[PDB]
Amino acid sequence: KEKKENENSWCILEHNYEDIAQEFIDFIYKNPTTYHVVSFFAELLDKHNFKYLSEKSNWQDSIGEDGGKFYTIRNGTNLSAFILGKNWRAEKGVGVIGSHVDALTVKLKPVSFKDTAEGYGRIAVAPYGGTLNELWLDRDLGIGGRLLYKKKGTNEIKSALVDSTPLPVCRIPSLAPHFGKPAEGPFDKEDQTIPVIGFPTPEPPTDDEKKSPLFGKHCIHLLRYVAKLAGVEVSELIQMDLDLFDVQKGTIGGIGKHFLFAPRLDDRLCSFAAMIALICYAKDVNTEESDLFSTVTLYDNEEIGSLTRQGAKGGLLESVVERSSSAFTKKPVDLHTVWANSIILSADVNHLYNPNFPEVYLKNHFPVPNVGITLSLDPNGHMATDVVGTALVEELARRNGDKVQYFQIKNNSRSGGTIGPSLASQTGARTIDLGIAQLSMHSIRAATGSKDVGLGVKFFNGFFKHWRSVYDEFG
């Protein structure tokens, strides 16, 4: 009864879109940084019997003839989960959803220390992508991310995740418009959009605290705070990679509750939907009987162009498929044949029609809320989508009872790029760019349809179930 109720809410089997929307909101709120997001999905995969495999060891002794359910992680921010059926062969190919788990944020600088300014404590930070604009002003900002530490009297460097939520430790204060021209944006990202962390009154550093490699690089108040959050000493902190982020919890909104308002939708929205879809699909997959290879791979650094080891161009997908297939058959695998028979969904959020800016949306080529997944189409290589991929997705949706929408830019407009073209050329596999549409992409707080999380999960679940069968129609 409880297991049947959980399957209905998570996998939208009983037509319940409210619960999955709430779980997405909870997920975003409880996992503010990329590190937290990858850790969330790792814990989720563990609970559904996926086995963690380390990149640093050869997989031949871990994967055998029976295949199974597995995942791996690179850099703590790039994760690939996969299901390998016992009866898989090269000609079956791979069914891939590729998304990104990085989101626009603000990073503490390597030295965050700033002199007090008339008593005000501030921290030196840097934008990750196009942040530190007017939308980041006057927002409640928490602090969180990865601390590296070394326990006193040991040599090993370990990792801890920290999160100030619900405490907003800082805020970037707008200047009152009373002052005139100085209060008009845009504002200088180095000199003007600086987080204000406190205003301390009249303990100084102890001799132990000074033994920290981070002493002098960050304010002692800050060091003590993150040390307390992680349950370690200040002296033990060696380094850190911390974000500032909006601590305003997401919510269902609109007068008819048609919307979901939440931070960091790009692209944790599709990443969540694809991952939940994989878990739902995996519940009814017996890997002893399956002839398929399925994966969701989640990348870092897409917002800065994907050219890092943990981004799409770093090749985790390709490595996973090569290592899995070599261990699985213990014999030479034709990876060119594998990728020639594969489909990659490059699942990245696209743009909902904004009725206040009709002039930038292409007629007949914009999505609306609460309908279904949106294909991203572009004739100049910004998206990897082609005629066969469009037809495949439309065929798949007709079979599974999903609706499909279009996005394409106006000829006089401008397009962003996704990981899709990178994945397509790296593998040689047909790649389809699509995703869950949203308003206000790259704002500190964005919006999508309240049913779109659930509709997304339904479509991706349908993909894993039927992509192979549908693609065989084209052969």
Ligand X SMILES: C[As](C)(=O)[O-]
Stretch 250-279 residues interacting with Zn ion (CB under 5 A): 266-267
Beta strands in 85-236 (DSSP E): 95-100, 105-108, 121-122, 125-128, 141-149, 158-163, 196-198
3-state secondary structure of 299: strand
Chain residues 333-392 in contact with Zn ion, contact rule CB under 5 A:
348
Nearest-10 Cα torsion for 35, 44, 29, 440: 80
Asked if 200 is part of the footprint of ligand X (rule: CB under 6 A), the reply reads no
178 is in an annotated binding site: yes
Instruction: Point out residues after which the chain has a gap (C–N over 2.5 Å).
Output: 202
How many positions of this chain bind ligand X (CB under 6 A)? 14
What x/- string results for residues 95 through 134 when contact with Zn ion is judged by CB under 5 A?
Answer: ----------------------------------------
Q: Could you please report the per-residue DSSP string of 414-439?
A: -----SHHHHHHHH--EEEEEE-EEB
Return the number of the residue (52 or 199) whose C-beta is nearest a second copy. 199
Q: Which helix (H) or strand (E) holds 346?
A: strand 343-347
How far is residue 205's CA from residue 16's CA, in Å, rounded to a whole number?
Answer: 55
Return the number of the residue (236 or 302) whose C-beta is nearest ligand X. 302
How far is residue 210's CA from residue 201's CA, in Å, rounded to a whole number?
Answer: 22
Biggest distance spanned by C-alpha atoms of the chain: 76
Torsion sign across C-alpha atoms 35, 41, 47, 49: negative
What x/- string results for residues 15 through 54 when contact with ligand X is judged by CB under 6 A?
Answer: ----------------------------------------
Q: How far is the CB of 180 from ligand X (least distance, A)?
A: 9
Among the candidate windows 25-33, 71-79, 146-154, 183-191, which touches ligand X by CB under 6 A?
Answer: 183-191
CA 217 from chain center: how many Å? 30
Chain residues 249-268 in contact with ligand X, contact rule CB under 6 A:
266-267
Return the number of the residue (201 or 286) whose C-beta is nearest a second copy. 201
3-state secondary structure of 112: coil
Return the number of the residue (11 or 170) whose C-beta is nearest a second copy. 170
Among the candidate windows 84-92, 179-187, 250-258, 458-466, which touches ligand X by CB under 6 A?
Answer: 179-187
Return the number of the residue (267 or 395) whose C-beta is nearest ligand X. 267
By CB under 6 A, name the binding residues for ligand X.
181-182, 184-188, 266-267, 302-303, 348, 416, 418
Which residue ranges make up the annotated binding site? Answer: 100, 178, 266, 302-303, 348, 351, 442
Which residue ranges make up the annotated binding site for substrate? Answer: 178, 302, 348, 351
